[PDB]
C-alpha cells in the first residue's frame, strides 16, 4: 500500500516538515541550472564562432568515430599521453602543473 | 595582482530580501555566515545556507561546494 | 651589472624542443614571442608562454615576470 509503504512520504517530501526547505532546494537546483545553461550556451556560442571562422564541412559522423576511436586508445595508452593527442588546454595544464611542482593533490576523493 | 585567492560575489537570498556578498573564493562557510549575519544583523546559529540542493554549514567550504563568483545562495533564517 | 640595460639568455622550452635566446632584460613578452616564433617559425597568435605558474602574454614583460639571464620559460603552441 502507498500509505504504509514509504510511510506515505509524510516526511520524505518536505525536509524537517518544512515545504519551504524543499522549495529553497528546488530553487537552488534551478539556480545552478540557469548558470549551467549560460555556460552551456556560452560554449555553443564560442563553438559557432569557431565554425564561422573555420571552414564548413558535413563530416560530423566521421568526427564522432574519430573521437570514439581515440578515446578508447587514449585510455589504454593513458600511461603515454601524447601532447598531439591531447588538446592545447590539456598540454598547457600539464606544463602549469609542473610549474607549481605538483599543482593540486592530483587525486580525486582521498581515501 | 596574481593572487591565488580571488574574491567572489554570491547573491544571498533571505525571507527578508536578497543581498550580494563578496568574499574570497577559498573562504569558508563560517566566514560567509559572519558576513551575512552582519548585514542582516542575524546569528550564524539561526541562519542556514542552502546550495546545490544541500544545506551549507560551517563544516562546509565555499569552493568545496563549487560556489564561485556570480553564484546564488539560499539563506534560511529559523 | 644592474646599471644600464643588459642582454640575457632565456631558455624557451617547446613541445618539440628548447632553445636559448639572447635579448635585453628589458625585452617585452611580445618581442620575445617574436624572437621565439622566428626560430621555431611559429606565430604569436598561437604562441603562449608559461612561467611562475601563469601564462605570460604580450601584455606582460620579461623582466616584469622576473625573466633574466639563465631563466627558463614554458612555450606552448596552440
Curated annotation (Swiss-Prot), chain A:
Residues 21-25, 92-96 are annotated as: Essential for ubiquitin-binding. Keywords: Isopeptide bond, Phosphoprotein, Proteasome, Repeat, Ubl conjugation. GO terms for biological process: proteasome-mediated ubiquitin-dependent protein catabolic process. Residues 2-67 are annotated as: Interaction with UBQLN1. The modification Phosphoserine is found at residues 61, 71. Residues 29-60 are annotated as: Disordered. Residues 16-35, 87-106 form the UIM domain. Residues 29-42 have a biased composition (Basic and acidic residues). The modification Phosphothreonine is found at residues 55, 58. One of its GO terms (molecular function) is RNA binding. One of its GO terms (cellular component) is proteasome regulatory particle, base subcomplex. It comes from the Eukaryota. Component of the 26S proteasome, a multiprotein complex involved in the ATP-dependent degradation of ubiquitinated proteins. This complex plays a key role in the maintenance of protein homeostasis by removing misfolded or damaged proteins, which could impair cellular functions, and by removing proteins whose functions are no longer required. Therefore, the proteasome participates in numerous cellular processes, including cell cycle progression, apoptosis, or DNA damage repair. Belongs to the proteasome subunit S5A family. Component of the 19S proteasome regulatory particle complex. The 26S proteasome consists of a 20S core particle (CP) and two 19S regulatory subunits (RP). The regulatory particle is made of a lid composed of 9 subunits, a base containing 6 ATPases and few additional components including PSMD4. Interacts with NUB1. Interacts with SQSTM1. Interacts with UBQLN4. Interacts with UBE3A. Interacts with UBQLN1 (via ubiquitin-like domain). Interacts with DDI2. The 2 UIM motifs are involved in the binding to a multi-ubiquitin chain in a cooperative way. This is 26S proteasome non-ATPase regulatory subunit 4. It comes from Homo sapiens. The gene is PSMD4. The chain holds residues 196 to 306 of 377 of the full protein.
Curated annotation (Swiss-Prot), chains B, C:
Degraded during macroautophagy. Induction: Highly expressed in mitotic cells from metaphase to telophase. Expression in non-mitotic cells is very low. It is found in: Cytoplasm; Nucleus; Membrane; Cytoplasmic vesicle, Autophagosome. Residues 8-78 form the Ubiquitin-like domain. The ubiquitin-like domain is essential for its inhibitory effect on GPCR endocytosis. Mediates its association with the subunits of the proteasome. It is linked to Amyotrophic lateral sclerosis 15, with or without frontotemporal dementia: A neurodegenerative disorder affecting upper motor neurons in the brain and lower motor neurons in the brain stem and spinal cord, resulting in fatal paralysis. Sensory abnormalities are absent. The pathologic hallmarks of the disease include pallor of the corticospinal tract due to loss of motor neurons, presence of ubiquitin-positive inclusions within surviving motor neurons, and deposition of pathologic aggregates. Homodimer. Forms heterodimer with UBQLN1. Binds UBE3A and BTRC. Interacts with the 19S proteasome subunit. Interacts with C9orf72. Interacts with HNRNPA1 and HNRNPU. Found in a complex with UBQLN1 and MAP1LC3A/B/C. Interacts with EPS15, EPN1 and EPN2. Interacts with HERPUD1. Interacts with RAD23A. Interacts with TARDBP. Interacts (via C-terminus) with FAF2 (via N-terminus). Interacts with UBQLN4. Binds CD47. Plays an important role in the regulation of different protein degradation mechanisms and pathways including ubiquitin-proteasome system (UPS), autophagy and the endoplasmic reticulum-associated protein degradation (ERAD) pathway. Mediates the proteasomal targeting of misfolded or accumulated proteins for degradation by binding (via UBA domain) to their polyubiquitin chains and by interacting (via ubiquitin-like domain) with the subunits of the proteasome. This is Ubiquilin-2. The chain holds residues 26 to 103 of 624 of the full protein.
